[PDB]
Design a protein around this nucleic acid. Structure first.
Ligand SMILES: [K+]
Ligand SMILES: [K+]
Ligand SMILES: [K+]
Ligand SMILES: [K+]
Ligand SMILES: [Mg+2]
Ligand SMILES: [Mg+2]
Ligand SMILES: [Mg+2]
Ligand SMILES: [Mg+2]
Ligand SMILES: [Mg+2]
Ligand SMILES: [Mg+2]
Ligand SMILES: [Mg+2]
Ligand SMILES: [Mg+2]
Ligand SMILES: [Mg+2]
Ligand SMILES: [Mg+2]
Ligand SMILES: [Mg+2]
Ligand SMILES: [Mg+2]
Ligand SMILES: [Mg+2]
Ligand SMILES: [Mg+2]
Ligand SMILES: [Mg+2]
Ligand SMILES: [Mg+2]
Ligand SMILES: [Mg+2]
Ligand SMILES: [Mg+2]
Ligand SMILES: [Mg+2]
Ligand SMILES: [Mg+2]
Ligand SMILES: [Mg+2]
Ligand SMILES: [Mg+2]
Ligand SMILES: [Mg+2]
Ligand SMILES: [Mg+2]
Ligand SMILES: [Mg+2]
Ligand SMILES: [Mg+2]
Ligand SMILES: [Mg+2]
Ligand SMILES: [Mg+2]
Ligand SMILES: [Mg+2]
Ligand SMILES: [Mg+2]
Ligand SMILES: [Mg+2]
Ligand SMILES: [Mg+2]
Ligand SMILES: [Mg+2]
Ligand SMILES: [Mg+2]
Ligand SMILES: [Mg+2]
Ligand SMILES: [Mg+2]
Ligand SMILES: [Mg+2]
Ligand SMILES: [Mg+2]
Ligand SMILES: [Mg+2]
Ligand SMILES: [Mg+2]
Ligand SMILES: [Mg+2]
Ligand SMILES: [Mg+2]
Ligand SMILES: [Mg+2]
Ligand SMILES: [Mg+2]
Ligand SMILES: [Mg+2]
Ligand SMILES: [Mg+2]
Ligand SMILES: [Mg+2]
Ligand SMILES: [Mg+2]
Ligand SMILES: [Mg+2]
Ligand SMILES: [Mg+2]
Ligand SMILES: [Mg+2]
Ligand SMILES: [Mg+2]
Ligand SMILES: [Mg+2]
Ligand SMILES: [Mg+2]
Ligand SMILES: [Mg+2]
Ligand SMILES: [Mg+2]
Ligand SMILES: [Mg+2]
Ligand SMILES: [Mg+2]
Ligand SMILES: [Mg+2]
Ligand SMILES: [Zn+2]
Lengths: 135, 134, 122, 86, 50, 155, 52, 59
RNA sequence: CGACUCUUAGCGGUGGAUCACUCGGCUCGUGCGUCGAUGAAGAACGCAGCUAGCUGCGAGAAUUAAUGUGAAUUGCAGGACACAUUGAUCAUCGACACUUCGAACGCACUUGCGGCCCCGGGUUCCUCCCGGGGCUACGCCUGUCUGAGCGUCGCU
RNA sequence: CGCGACCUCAGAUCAGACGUGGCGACCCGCUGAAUUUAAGCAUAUUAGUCAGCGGAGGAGAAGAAACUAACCAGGAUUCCCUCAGUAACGGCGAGUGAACAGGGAAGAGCCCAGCGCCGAAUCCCCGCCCCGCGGCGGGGCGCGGGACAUGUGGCGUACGG
RNA sequence: CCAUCUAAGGCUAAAUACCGGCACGAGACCGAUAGUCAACAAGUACCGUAAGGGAAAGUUGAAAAGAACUUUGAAGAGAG
RNA sequence: CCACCCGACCCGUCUUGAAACACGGACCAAGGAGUCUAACACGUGCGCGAGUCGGGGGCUCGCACGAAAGCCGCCGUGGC
RNA sequence: CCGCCGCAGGUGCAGAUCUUGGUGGUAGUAGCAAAUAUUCAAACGAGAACUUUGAAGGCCGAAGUGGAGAAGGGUUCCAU
């Protein structure tokens, strides 16, 4: 999990927020692995990642990276999408398969939290007071 | 009434553009009417005032029929100096008094290649508008 | 005389440098006159010579760079200063040829099912 | 003696001029600037001080290059061309 | 101090050059409102802080 | 504090609502912008209908609205198959296609099949090459009748 | 800025106001009461041919 | 002389040498409190500073 | 009889209210929506004949070229080839130029100390010295070269 | 012994490229309080909000159903009105609180892997020539190099092929 | 039993947002103790080791015509 | 302005009780405090009335005013 | 710049140890009293208790009221 990084386990709040252990990170370890690979190789684009093994202390993932400036990539219309600037650091914005799994996206009764594109988008829409001109 | 949405009617804006206009714009701002004979001759109502132009002062304390030459166009002050439009300082020095070019009438133009080009542009356009009004 | 960039265009490289040298010598003398008393006429010539030097140097640099562009025209690789600047992001965008590339599948769709011009009667 | 007398012993500079932001906040012993965060790669900036943000944001300086980009934008960043000779 | 770096000396150079009164002919210019240098530093009153 | 007789009210104003207040002062500007875009699009696509492609009749679901019909997203593949229109061709000639929709009853299928056939008769098809026409509408039909049909196609 | 600047008026009430305004414009006593200087006007309402 | 702060004694000696076509024995430089670099350029004994000052225009 | 004190008026001061003014804000709206290793944002220092700030600019420094424009700029002065029509000035700006620090890039941050290549000078003919130019950061992609392995094999 | 092939690695100021930092109103991914309300207070509320970190673009994200429904059925996403202060949550206290249908704004659909078949039919780099031609390339050539059977390309994707 | 879709790969304009920026228009707004902190050499002067804090300050006249000259005074300052 | 006769304690505030040995107030100028939004109740005015209401959208060759106004009706979906 | 008919509001001050600016009585008052001490003549000058020169009387008294530095200051140095 994700231990709360507070000094000596003191949270300085109400008991509801006194938790330091048994806490879990919002994103998966596969998402963290993509983020690490993406940060180190800033000139490449994270496409996807897959599991290859685990032990008690470590999980091993293999991240597929694409060089967006290689001619074999830029001259192929099927992969020209990854070369566009809007796809910079997809792994850091939750746009890879592993990253988007934690966002609560989806269709249906289960995924109402993220109507509008994200949990933040839905919250903004539902907490914005629409004051029309004629009221 | 003005209808152009890209032209402002704001008092503060128009004053700001006027008092901070660059010199070449100030040239257009410092236009003066031609005399009746000049207006009839060139079919032009107004010209940007130039040094070595003979003018009459038609408004103010120096109004009269005297023909004087424009000796200095001080655009930064929006005023012109005319050769006999002067006054006596205390110590006896004679200083020109600034006259706004809209308050003078050009009686003789300093014609060179540029003025002749400018005059034939205004008259061609005034005549072309008649081909509109008709 | 009056130094004009127009006149300097046809001059050779050697005499352009020579003109630059005489101007630089003259400016040094004027700066001497600035501290050794010196009349107003000599002081007011400082700006004239200073801008005259810039006029000669601009002609030399403009001539020297355009010769490079003619030499590097048609070469696969050119110095970065001789390359289009624009903005970093426009320099990193797909080129027109790459942007006009279509897969055979897309080409087959366009050939078979082109958009039609049609009207509907009321 | 914590007041006037102790003020006389202040003769060692904690901070000096920063080589990046020019503020006199480069802590000598820590070798870090309390203004811009030098030598950190990223600029020190906090949303808790908007005043501090607007004191040094883009716009309080010269725009030696941006205000040329703003001009060149209005014509589509054209290059390699000149007006027709007269 | 007599011991000084080049950067500090160059900094003190700029501060001396700036600490001068306005030229008297500035006042005669059109639209002038500067009647005296309001950024004059006296070595004993206000310190540079460096 | 309550006072005498009143309604118990729970106004939802305990968050920082003042930070998220959407005013509508650009509503007139938005309406102008949408209008100009509609007009610009119509001029670009003329003489094709301004509203867009023809839509099918669908029955609204639930017991509250099953007595009413409305415009659907697109014609089903079965409706296009019966009408004899290739699903790829339908989009080019202005027919919306919805592969997700399935026809549960034959009454709905025949209603939309008839709608497609009647649309096809009303359609004026310009040749891809003006000089050479193959299976397109008649020159006379194109010359005069063609005009941009405003409003939904066959409401 | 989220003061209530604008106001709604019923369409029927807006239409009633136009009717009352038109009716009053045909009464010389009310037009003159608005200082409209119509002493030499031939008739109220004043109707002119469509070639205008 | 007042010289560029970038210049060193070797450059100052070389500049003075063939600007004024003289020989230089020693160069002593300081940076004055107004940030300028002042160079004391002592010429060779055969050259006369007063003569050179006349040709320059210093006096 | 005066002072002194108080009250009220006239005038004078002290002070900067009031009124009038407004190249400034605030609010709403619209169009666009563009930074950077080809060195940004920011900082420093410097640049004017007289100029400290503001502004502008970068050793070509209160600007060069070009285009448009068409006689100024101006506080003073100076220049009739620096007082210009063979183009003043202003605007535009596409050409050229663009110091130091800064993601900041040889290393270090003291204008501290190197390395490699080329050119000129020291009569250079070596070493060495001086000047000038180019290069020398981290990560990463494709490709090349040079290699490592009692990793897996083949032949002898 | 050695000579070769491959694999896994390493060095280079190797040839050519790419990332960094800024701005941050709006957007995406995390992290995340307490003041406050509850007339005390701990769950709750404040609030997934402020502060903190990362990443973008002119928009972003979302997006062509492992959907809604239970009807005579609709049919990607986003936004608006309504649903609705409702169903529901809640020391069932204070408080909190969506969705589907309906009406609109806009409207647009698609691609792989796999499974097969086609003599790798595919791609990158280099050298030369010809033509448009500020490097954008088109073609031709080369018993040129490399990638690639640990699988490139054509066809094809749940609407079937 | 029935309904409904086909997850664990990917792309995609529009309608939407925009207290930063580049230009621009407007206002039943404020009118120099107001309106931005800032109408002015304002994020300036100044303060703090520092993070940071942070002002005051508009108006001659239509035009400088900004009071030559005489006179008292050392002058500031007066009288003409 | 002054004289005289009679009357006459300093205001604001909290308080059962203030001229108080209760607190604030040296003086003068300018600034200075029930607002706006949403909701709800009742009362009053106006329109229409078993209905009523377009507020969201659209149409009118957008645009000084006009970001207004007018219109919709198989736009009344929807609210009540 | 105002009257009248309507419209709109950041709309009325004596107080808030109110905010900012200005000004009084106090008041020509308190004070200009830590470390022994000044005097004569002349000069310059409009002007001398205080400047300069000379003379006298004193003090620091080598752990200095002397002569040089570090830190810090940053031109304060020197001349006019
Ligand atoms: K020119
Ligand atoms: K009280
Ligand atoms: K009291
Ligand atoms: K010292
Ligand atoms: Mg806490
Ligand atoms: Mg979380
Ligand atoms: Mg996107
Ligand atoms: Mg996507
Ligand atoms: Mg959802
Ligand atoms: Mg809400
Ligand atoms: Mg205004
Ligand atoms: Mg394919
Ligand atoms: Mg203490
Ligand atoms: Mg320390
Ligand atoms: Mg001190
Ligand atoms: Mg539509
Ligand atoms: Mg030295
Ligand atoms: Mg008075
Ligand atoms: Mg006064
Ligand atoms: Mg020029
Ligand atoms: Mg050191
Ligand atoms: Mg290399
Ligand atoms: Mg970044
Ligand atoms: Mg904005
Ligand atoms: Mg409580
Ligand atoms: Mg309480
Ligand atoms: Mg408590
Ligand atoms: Mg929360
Ligand atoms: Mg935050
Ligand atoms: Mg961008
Ligand atoms: Mg979009
Ligand atoms: Mg699908
Ligand atoms: Mg839906
Ligand atoms: Mg309800
Ligand atoms: Mg629960
Ligand atoms: Mg909540
Ligand atoms: Mg719905
Ligand atoms: Mg395949
Ligand atoms: Mg795709
Ligand atoms: Mg005032
Ligand atoms: Mg103010
Ligand atoms: Mg203020
Ligand atoms: Mg009591
Ligand atoms: Mg009382
Ligand atoms: Mg008592
Ligand atoms: Mg009390
Ligand atoms: Mg008191
Ligand atoms: Mg008041
Ligand atoms: Mg009522
Ligand atoms: Mg109605
Ligand atoms: Mg308007
Ligand atoms: Mg309307
Ligand atoms: Mg109803
Ligand atoms: Mg209904
Ligand atoms: Mg008001
Ligand atoms: Mg008030
Ligand atoms: Mg008061
Ligand atoms: Mg009161
Ligand atoms: Mg006394
Ligand atoms: Mg005493
Ligand atoms: Mg003693
Ligand atoms: Mg003694
Ligand atoms: Mg002793
Ligand atoms: Zn710093």
């Amino acid at each position: 999990g994700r231990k709360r990084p507070v000094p000596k386990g003191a949270t300085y709040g109400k008991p509801v927020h006194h938790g330091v252990n048994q806490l879990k990170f919002a994103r998966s370890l596969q998402s963290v692995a993509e983020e690490r690979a993406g940060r180190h190789c800033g000139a490449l684009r994270v496409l996807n990642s897959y599991w290859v093994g685990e032990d008690s202390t470590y999980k091993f993932f293999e991240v597929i990276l694409i060089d967006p400036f290689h001619k074999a990539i830029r001259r192929n219309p099927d992969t020209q999408w990854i070369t566009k600037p809007v796809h910079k650091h997809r792994e850091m914005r939750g746009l890879t398969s592993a990253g988007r799994k934690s966002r609560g996206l989806g269709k249906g009764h289960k995924f109402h939290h993220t109507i509008g594109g994200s949990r933040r988008a839905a919250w903004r829409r539902r907490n914005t007071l629409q004051l029309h001109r004629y009221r | 009434m003005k209808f152009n949405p890209f032209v402002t009617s704001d008092r503060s804006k128009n004053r700001k553009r006027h008092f901070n206009a660059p010199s070449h714009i100030r040239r257009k701002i410092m236009s003066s009417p031609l005399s009746k004979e000049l207006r009839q001759k060139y079919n032009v109502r107004s010209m940007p005032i130039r040094k070595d132009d003979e003018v009459q002062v038609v408004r103010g304390h120096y109004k009269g029929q005297q023909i004087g030459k424009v000796v200095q166009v001080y655009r930064k002050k929006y005023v012109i100096y005319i050769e006999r439009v002067q006054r006596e300082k205390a110590n006896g020095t004679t200083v020109h008094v600034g006259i706004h070019p809209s308050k003078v009438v050009i009686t003789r133009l300093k014609l060179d290649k540029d003025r002749k080009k400018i005059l034939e542009r205004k008259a061609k356009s005034r005549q072309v508008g008649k081909e509109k009004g008709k | 005389a009056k130094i004009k960039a127009r006149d300097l265009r046809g001059k050779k490289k050697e005499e352009l440098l020579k003109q630059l040298d005489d101007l630089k010598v003259e400016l040094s003398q004027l700066r001497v006159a600035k501290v050794t008393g010196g009349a107003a006429s000599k002081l007011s010539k400082i700006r004239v010579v200073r801008k005259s030097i810039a006029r000669v140097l601009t002609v030399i640099n403009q001539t020297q760079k355009e010769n490079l562009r003619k030499f590097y025209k048609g070469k696969k690789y050119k110095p970065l200063d001789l390359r289009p600047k624009k903005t970093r992001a426009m320099r990193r965008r797909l080129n027109k040829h790459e942007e006009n590339l279509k897969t055979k599948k897309q080409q087959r769709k366009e050939r078979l099912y082109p958009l039609r011009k049609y009207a509907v009667k009321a | 003696t914590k007041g006037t007398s102790s003020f006389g012993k202040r003769r060692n500079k904690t901070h000096t001029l920063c080589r990046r932001c020019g503020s006199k906040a480069y802590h000598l012993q820590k070798s870090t600037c309390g203004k811009c965060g030098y030598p950190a790669k990223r600029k020190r900036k906090y949303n808790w001080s908007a005043k501090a943000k607007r004191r040094n944001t883009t716009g309080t300086g010269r725009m030696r290059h941006l205000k040329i980009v703003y001009r060149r934008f209005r014509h589509g960043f054209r290059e390699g061309t000149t007006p027709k000779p007269k | 101090s007599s011991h000084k770096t080049f950067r500090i000396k160059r900094f003190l150079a700029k501060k001396q050059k700036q600490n001068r009164p306005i030229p008297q002919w500035i006042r005669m210019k059109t639209g002038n409102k500067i009647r005296y240098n309001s950024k004059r530093r006296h070595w004993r009153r206000t310190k540079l802080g460096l | 504090a309550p006072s005498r007789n009143g309604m118990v009210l729970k106004p939802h104003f305990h968050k920082d609502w003042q930070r998220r207040v959407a005013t509508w002062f650009n509503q007139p500007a938005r309406k102008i912008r949408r209008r100009k875009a509609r007009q610009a699009k119509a001029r670009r696509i003329a003489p094709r209908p301004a509203s867009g492609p023809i839509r099918p009749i669908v029955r609204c679901p639930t017991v509250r609205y099953h007595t009413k019909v409305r415009a659907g997203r697109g014609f089903s593949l079965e409706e296009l198959r019966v009408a004899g229109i290739h699903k790829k061709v339908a989009r080019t000639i202005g027919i919306s296609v919805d592969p997700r929709r399935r026809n549960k009853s034959t009454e709905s299928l025949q209603a939309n099949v008839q709608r497609l056939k009647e649309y096809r008769s009303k359609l004026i098809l310009f040749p891809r090459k003006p000089s050479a026409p193959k299976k397109g509408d008649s020159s006379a039909e194109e010359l005069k009748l063609a005009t941009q049909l405003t409003g939904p196609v066959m409401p | 800025t989220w003061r209530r600047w604008h106001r709604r008026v019923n369409t029927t009430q807006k239409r009633y106001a136009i009717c009352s305004a038109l009716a009053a414009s045909a009464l010389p006593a009310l037009v003159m009461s608005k200082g409209h200087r119509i002493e030499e006007v031939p008739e109220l309402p004043l109707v002119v041919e469509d070639k205008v | 002389f007042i010289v560029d702060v970038k210049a060193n004694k070797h450059q100052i000696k070389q500049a003075v040498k063939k600007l004024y076509d003289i020989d230089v024995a020693k160069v002593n430089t300081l940076i004055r409190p107004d940030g300028e670099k002042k160079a004391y350029v002592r010429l060779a004994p055969d050259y006369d500073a007063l003569d050179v000052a006349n040709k320059i225009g210093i006096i």
